[PDB]
Symmetry: C3
Subunit: 490 residues, 3 copies
């Protein structure tokens, strides 16, 4: 039974964008690049303040008595081995996002410097990206992951975000407004969040193509068309297979750069980027548009605030995944797992790519070149022996990522587009994929030169509504837990 009460109000907005954006582009590119400014100016304090509130909240919940509570029936144990569990989180924190920013993120920070500091600064270059890909995001994925796991396993509600809000709102199934609105926002967010990955991943393919068979905007459509097409072919079975073919390619690329690049230096950056990240954490936690001397405003809009929005928009999906994979875990074991494990991949993957990118800058090999993030990865690879064949596998890996990232995404979307049915309808899954690949393709076309700007801009806008929901999820979750049987028994 497809809950149309949600499917359509979320299809109105998804279509409206792929309507007043693709053809009627002027009003789109304009409205977007000003609406993004509206929220970053008056709501940046929100993304920032609550962004670190999540990391605290979630840590104190782990350390709380709630930690011993078991996501499932009383004294229930896990469905999988711990190491099997961990390896599903290692692969959980991997994909387009790390491909695209792995090289340019720390690079840009080193080359252009950071508000509150100066250029050519490794420590700050590294600890800043650590900031963007470690504790902060996964706290959000933990908040949403936990809320879902708890409501669907421990209390046996529907696997919908709306359900996690029962303690506060419900008010029955919280139906009508709110319950529907929460899940409606959950859908929208998931779409644009993944549309932001499918998008820039598609324009990292294009840039990669300029390293073999060889800017024509048409190609981007050509790219998306084939990938979104393979998405439909492989949505009839699969994800479990390619998500395993991803970890070989990715490991091949990383292990490659690690050996064939400045091995010792990359290694140096492990303790470095972790030691810096802990030293600067709160300084970074304290950067708003008021620093540095009312100057760090613009930067924050293009990094810290963007990411924050993107992480929050991707929490309905990633939250589902973790919950769906952590049944039987204690709340404490869950939190610590979701925080510490995924961040291991980030830390390493950035030290591998962004690490050698920094070393090339210092040694005059600079792979910057016109400063187009999209074509920086291949810039890196090419500077390494055998990096001409690696630059291709890098594309084939982005290709496979695109698909799987859209399989898993749409599954979760179908799941919440019909009363939280785990049994995903193979049609309502595909219907959400090509719909996501639409706005992914829309943000690319509507911008051209900028592209990446609007691709980051609108997601910042599609996410801001859902920020307040995650914020409320903190309240909906302390109530559930303090009303738990075990906690009332202790």
């Amino acid at each position: 039974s497809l809950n149309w009460s949600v499917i359509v109000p979320a299809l109105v907005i998804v279509l409206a964008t792929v309507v007043w954006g693709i053809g009627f582009k002027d009003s789109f590119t304009n409205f977007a690049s000003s609406a993004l400014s509206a929220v970053v100016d008056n709501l940046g304090w929100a993304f920032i303040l609550f962004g670190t509130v999540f990391v605290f909240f979630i840590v104190v919940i782990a350390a709380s008595k709630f930690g011993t509570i078991r996501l499932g029936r009383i004294d229930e144990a896990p469905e999988f081995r711990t190491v099997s569990w961990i390896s599903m989180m290692f692969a959980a924190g991997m994909g387009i996002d790390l491909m695209f920013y792995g090289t340019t993120e720390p690079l840009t920070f080193y080359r252009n410097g950071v508000p509150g500091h100066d250029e050519h600064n490794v420590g700050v270059a590294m600890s800043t990206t650590m900031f963007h890909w470690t504790l902060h995001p996964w706290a959000i994925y933990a908040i949403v992951g936990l809320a879902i796991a708890y409501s669907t396993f421990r209390v046996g509600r529907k696997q919908l975000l709306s359900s996690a809000f029962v303690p506060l709102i419900g008010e029955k199934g919280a139906e009508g407004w709110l319950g529907k609105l929460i899940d409606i926002l959950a859908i929208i967010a998931t779409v644009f969040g993944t549309a932001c990955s499918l998008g820039l991943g598609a324009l990292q393919i294009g840039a990669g193509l300029s390293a073999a068979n060889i800017p024509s905007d048409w190609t981007i459509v050509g790219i998306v068309s084939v990938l979104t097409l393979a998405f439909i072919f492989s949505a009839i079975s699969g994800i479990q297979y390619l998500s395993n073919a991803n970890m070989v390619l990715a490991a091949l690329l990383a292990i490659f750069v690690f050996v064939v690049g400045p091995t010792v230096s990359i290694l140096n950056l492990l303790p470095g980027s972790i030691g810096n990240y802990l030293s600067n954490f709160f300084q970074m936690a304290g950067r708003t548009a008021m620093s540095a001397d009312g100057t760090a405003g613009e930067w924050l809009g293009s990094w810290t605030i963007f990411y924050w929005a993107w992480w929050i928009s991707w929490s309905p999906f990633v939250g589902m995944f973790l919950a769906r994979i952590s049944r039987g875990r204690s709340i404490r074991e869950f939190i610590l797992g979701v925080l510490l494990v995924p961040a291991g991949v980030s830390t390493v993957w950035f030290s591998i790519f962004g690490g050698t990118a920094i070393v090339f800058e210092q040694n005059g090999e600079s792979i910057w070149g016109d400063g187009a993030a999209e074509e920086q990865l291949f810039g890196l690879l090419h500077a390494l022996p055998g990096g001409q064949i690696m630059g291709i596998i890098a594309m084939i890996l982005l290709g496979t990522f695109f698909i799987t990232s859209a399989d898993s995404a749409s599954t979760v979307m179908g799941t919440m587009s019909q009363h939280g049915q785990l049994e995903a309808n193979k049609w309502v899954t595909a219907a959400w994929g090509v719909a996501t690949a639409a706005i992914g393709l829309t943000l690319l076309l509507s911008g051209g030169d900028n592209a990446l700007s609007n691709l980051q801009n609108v997601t910042i806008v599609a996410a801001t509504p859902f920020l307040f929901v995650v914020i409320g999820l903190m309240f909906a979750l302390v109530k559930d837990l303090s009303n738990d049987v075990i906690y009332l028994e202790y």
Copy 2:
């Protein structure tokens, strides 16, 4: 029971110094500016070290099992309500200075910079101000007020500074060599503290009168015209019982303070004041230790004088109010829990202050940034109003800022003038009106007395003297830190 035995040495010493101030003169203006510089040069290390140990100690103790143990028989609903339990604490410890320094403190640090930092650093500016007004001070308040509220409302010992040390002292020798000298220092430092913070506070009101009185602050006419309205503003708030006086007075003060802050928040630079919430907190945590460890040995041995004007002076300043502030914080929490009490005198005056400073100092800095500075000549008393007048409805709001200056002083005087009578009556919670009104009119006398040297000066002088006289107290809070653990331990 008019204790007695200790009032003699007090009254005569508070009298001897006030004669040294109006009589000999100069030789007393010599002491203040040299004695203070003496303690700050030598005991400086002991203020900033045990200053950060005071903070980690109450945190550890509140997070410990002892946090759960109530401060009563076991079942005893708190005498006063919640939002007033708080109001009373904040509005009793905090003086008038929060009114001005909320603007000056941040603005100054921004303009000039602080040791080991370049100027115009917004983060460092908010951080250092918080470091001075948030966690640290309210720790050297909690530690005293807790030791007391426990020594009495849980053990039973008379509400006296000597009883809290019983677990260390001869357990009854708290009425001899030390016991006496402690209750004496506690009243001498409580009389002086209230003395100058009264008359000298009346001067702040003088300059504050810039949109109303408009000079020349009729030399002494309006200064005495303020000391009168002020002295005859409390003394009744105290003797009329906390019920309508202290309690209701402190709740009004908070509502107006709240009201004023909300004004400059909405009409002022909102999204900026809003950004300085994470900015201030984040920078605070980020800078906490490097400033917890800023000593006169940095930078390269230069911050000594800056510390002498700020950090250290404050630690001595607050240590100088603990006697009568911790005494009032205990009496307002009959059946409060140690854990809640602590995170009720720490984790809320800190919140309040952080919001306060971010709103006022944040605005002062947003103006300074857009070239529309409100520094003007650099006087504290006028910066606040200069800040207000710059906003629509500023002149109007100026008058309720004036009301706030009075209330912010009086709520501290009336509340602290009750404790003057209690520690002069063997430690009676309830005190005779004729004694708590005598100690309020015997300080207004010495405060109004030092208005003979033209004005100010001697008031600021004896202030500094009170600090060097209340310096022994730093060692009290260290030891009180010991006679609270080796007392909470011998519980049940």
Copy 3:
């Protein structure tokens, strides 16, 4: 009993290194300098990373439930009682360098500045030295001293060091390709280190004996002979515990010239440096823990090579003797009580030591009276106290100090190396221990010839290069210390009770939601 499959191949390599130094040099000198220049370069990242991990590990372990697990059978009271307990730990712990470094290292960082900072940074100066001399080096010790203490006393195996790896590789089958090689490295690393510390220790005594004029040579060979004779005796006067006299005497003396430079020198400038040092330390903690050769801007390669990475790789080489020696003394003390007697206390005295000595050295530097004498660490100690009322008179006890401060690291060391030669026993046994002592001195003054200073300076470099695998040992010792610790009866009994309570409570719960759910069907 004696282990002639460990003690034998130990001597065959401690002698092949002799020939390397004396009968060759160059190939010795150059290699000894080209080797650590590779472990610093290639394994530096790991020294740095795990050095900080160590600190956290035994800190959580301490505050953990494993915390109150007595070191030895449940009852059992301390064998020495405190005071002298931590007193001798600091004795086997910090050599003669705490003297000629506790004063010159704060000054050198202040005067030359530290990577990522300007010079004359009093904060960073006190900050960085603590980083090298407090929490990070004593973690390396407590971990080793814990694995071993728990292993021998609580469980009940040999004092031998590979008795801590039975948890990972066999109840005793950990004997062959590994285990005995761990013992063989330990016995080697101890012989070398106790030898160099004797040669370079000696070369210093004289270079510092110019306090209260003649150079060195020969009249310095007589100095090593009063030490190599005083640390071997020891042996008796215990029995085997003459260490108490000396070790527990480094308080009255060291506290004496400490309280001297404290009251005579700039008392307030030191006092101020107490919060200044702690505060700054905590503040720069993770910054320093993050500092590698890729920061700053790819520049701090050499400074770390000369300072931090060399320090870490140095404490890891020393870890065996201290870890082993820290095993006893601690018998009958909580995992917690032991972790705080190896961390907080030594870290607390080192702070005050650096504040007073290294502190005034920074103060004189500020007022113009620089103590920096051509950059010689030897004189700088004496050159400083010479500038104080009682300069020569204290320079004497400072000289008696650097003398006793050495033999405490040799008398205990010998005790240990002798223990790891006789199947890990705890009794004196005069010789063997004394046999390891004289044989230690052999290289001390044999290396000294044909090579000059480079002899002991390159040997003590090689000692490290052949002790770097120990890094990995202290890494794995974490996995053993916890895999072992978690099989403790008191603990197994603890969690087993928790498991039962989880089941039982669930039983009560699940039988109530039945009663009241049908009891609530009675209210149809």
